[PDB]
Amino acid sequence: GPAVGIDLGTTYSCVGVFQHGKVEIIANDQGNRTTPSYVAFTDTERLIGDAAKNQVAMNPTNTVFDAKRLIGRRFDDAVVQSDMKHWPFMVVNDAGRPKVQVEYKGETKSFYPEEVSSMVLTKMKEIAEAYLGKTVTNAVVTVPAYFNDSQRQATKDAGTIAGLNVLRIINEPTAAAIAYGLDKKVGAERNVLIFDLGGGTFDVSILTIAAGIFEVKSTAGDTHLGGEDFDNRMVNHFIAEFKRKHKKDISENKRAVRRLRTACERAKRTLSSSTQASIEIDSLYEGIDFYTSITRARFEELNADLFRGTLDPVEKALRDAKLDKSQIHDIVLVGGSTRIPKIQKLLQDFFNGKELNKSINPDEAVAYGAAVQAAILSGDDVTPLSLGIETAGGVMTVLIKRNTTIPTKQTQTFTTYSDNQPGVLIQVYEGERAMTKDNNLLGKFELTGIPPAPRGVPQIEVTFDIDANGILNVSAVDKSTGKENKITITNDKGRLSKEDIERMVQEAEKYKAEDEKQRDKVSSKNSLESYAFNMKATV
Ligand SMILES: O=C(O)CNC(CO)(CO)CO
Ligand SMILES: [K+]
Ligand SMILES: [K+]
């Protein structure tokens, strides 16, 4: 049958299907297009989704949430340890592997984070099956771009337990871009900033999209910032107001705080579309009815630090991506909290008036992209890789960047690394990695007869030329004598598939921090040696 796209989120999960040329976000039993990522254990039954969240106050100890925070992690991690403080459910050490302890049918039961996530995936699969009328096995599950291999594997394992065959694990920012069809946009290297403000998590990702290939240049955000924090500021304000107006603290009564929180959540939604919102609660504390109103401006004032702090991760992502704000070509809003007008104004003003892509429901965009990717996997002139030469230390120095329109001619000047160097070896490589060993060797040629001189004085000009056919000609000239040597590298049709380019870009993303340190180690950027570093029998 048709494959489904699943957004497994920390607070909420969404499932979508591409059928008859259209993506449909599938509603649950209660008519909700988003299902809470909550699993509840009771003396008689196991509850998943909205039902679990509705009874959380009654059974906090046995209601589980924020499993995505523990997936593919270790009990020792500071994140795990810090998070446990705010969780009513028990997290226990099992040989350093985090597991949740709950009471189920009178037996204490412990479950892995992937097991809890599998139960959420089971509900999403069931929601899809009820809508489709057919069993759904194939699925594409999304993960945060910063997730490591163990977290991604743990997510795939959760689907495997659920009975789903996970065709691919894809980044949530990449899924949002696919939903907006940024990949299908014409041209070269569009830079995309995904601004994701969920209920409990904030993510900012910069992606460069070129010829259908996505590269995650940078990631930034706050794992503990979301819409709930905005609700908390409103709740604290109203508790203070009641204490001033009626001289009572309602914080003692759990039900009173819960009723106020629900009113604050409804008011925040109203404030997204209206200037003011009304709070009406009967007998909130000691029989006193609380009837009051809040303006959008007061809501903005209560959350001013949180709203403006959103720009700081955007600034860090731009610095890590080494891009100016002007170089961003597309901005995508993901998450319900992005509906807030102040957040949109702060981002648009920071980007000097740039339009924001908000057209697809922010809560459903990641699932929408996952569904398009699932369909593509199921039935449903530019340069592919960076081209460069090896510099001293086996470093890759790029002369032609990936996705550069062809024909192109690029020239750089290099020097000897050793005193009285007789010659230089020009080694041509293809790849996105800092070291040539991690890149592909295309050809090598030798320039010799260099006049004896101190290191840094001989000048060797290397030129890369691509005739429109795509044939690469690499030439080196000794500037002192005019002596030259060149290699012609044939472009075989089908040498690289789309997957081959994707794997090498994904490898560069996985090792970006380590790759940067290797670039920092060599003092001179363009010094050339007379030997292949990869074939040296040292270290
Ligand atoms: O909360 C998260 O896990 C990430 N946020 C999204 C919800 O899953 C996914 O991108 C969208 O807000
Ligand atoms: K997801
Ligand atoms: K997020």
UniProtKB/Swiss-Prot annotation:
Tissues expressed in: Ubiquitous.
PTM comment: Acetylated. ISGylated.
Modified residues (N6-acetyllysine): K105, K243, K316, K325, K498, K510
GO cellular component: cytoplasm; cytosol; lysosomal membrane; melanosome; nucleolus; nucleus; plasma membrane; presynapse
Omega-N-methylarginine, modified sites: R455
Membrane topology note: Peripheral membrane protein
Sites where the protein binds ATP: 9-12, 68, 199-201, 265-272, 336-339
Residues found modified as N6-succinyllysine: K316, K498
Record cross-link Glycyl lysine isopeptide (Lys-Gly) (interchain with G-Cter in SUMO2), residues: K498
Keyword Repressor set for record: yes
Keywords from the UniProt entry: Acetylation, ATP-binding, Autophagy, Cell membrane, Chaperone, Cytoplasm, Hydrolase, Isopeptide bond, Lysosome, Membrane, Methylation, mRNA processing, mRNA splicing, Nucleotide-binding, Nucleus, Phosphoprotein, Repressor, Spliceosome, Stress response, Transcription, Transcription regulation, Ubl conjugation
Catalytic activity: ATP + H2O = ADP + phosphate + H(+)
Subcellular location: Cytoplasm; Melanosome; Nucleus, Nucleolus; Cell membrane
Region (Substrate-binding domain (SBD)): 381-495
Annotated GO MF terms: ATP binding; ATP hydrolysis activity; ATP-dependent protein folding chaperone; heat shock protein binding; protein folding chaperone; protein-macromolecule adaptor activity
Entry EC number(s): 3.6.4.10
Top-level division of the source organism's lineage: Eukaryota
Root EC class: hydrolase
Residues with PTM Phosphoserine: S150, S326, S359, S527
Ranges for region Interaction with BAG1: 183-374
Induction: Constitutively synthesized.
Positions bound to ADP: T11, Y12, G199, E265, K268, S272, G336
Protein family (similarity comment): Belongs to the heat shock protein 70 family.
Subunit structure comment from the entry: Component of the chaperone-assisted selective autophagy (CASA) complex consisting of BAG3, HSPA8/HSC70, HSPB8 and STUB1/CHIP. Identified in a IGF2BP1-dependent mRNP granule complex containing untranslated mRNAs. Interacts with PACRG. Interacts with HSPH1/HSP105. Interacts with IRAK1BP1 and BAG1. Interacts with DNAJC7. Interacts with DNAJB12 (via J domain). Interacts with DNAJB14 (via J domain). Interacts (via C-terminus) with the E3 ligase STUB1 forming a 210 kDa complex of one STUB1 and two HSPA8 molecules.
Domain description: The N-terminal nucleotide binding domain (NBD) (also known as the ATPase domain) is responsible for binding and hydrolyzing ATP. The C-terminal substrate-binding domain (SBD) (also known as peptide-binding domain) binds to the client/substrate proteins. The two domains are allosterically coupled so that, when ATP is bound to the NBD, the SBD binds relatively weakly to clients. When ADP is bound in the NBD, a conformational change enhances the affinity of the SBD for client proteins.
Name by which UniProt lists this protein: Heat shock cognate 71 kDa protein
Gene that this polypeptide is encoded by: HSPA8
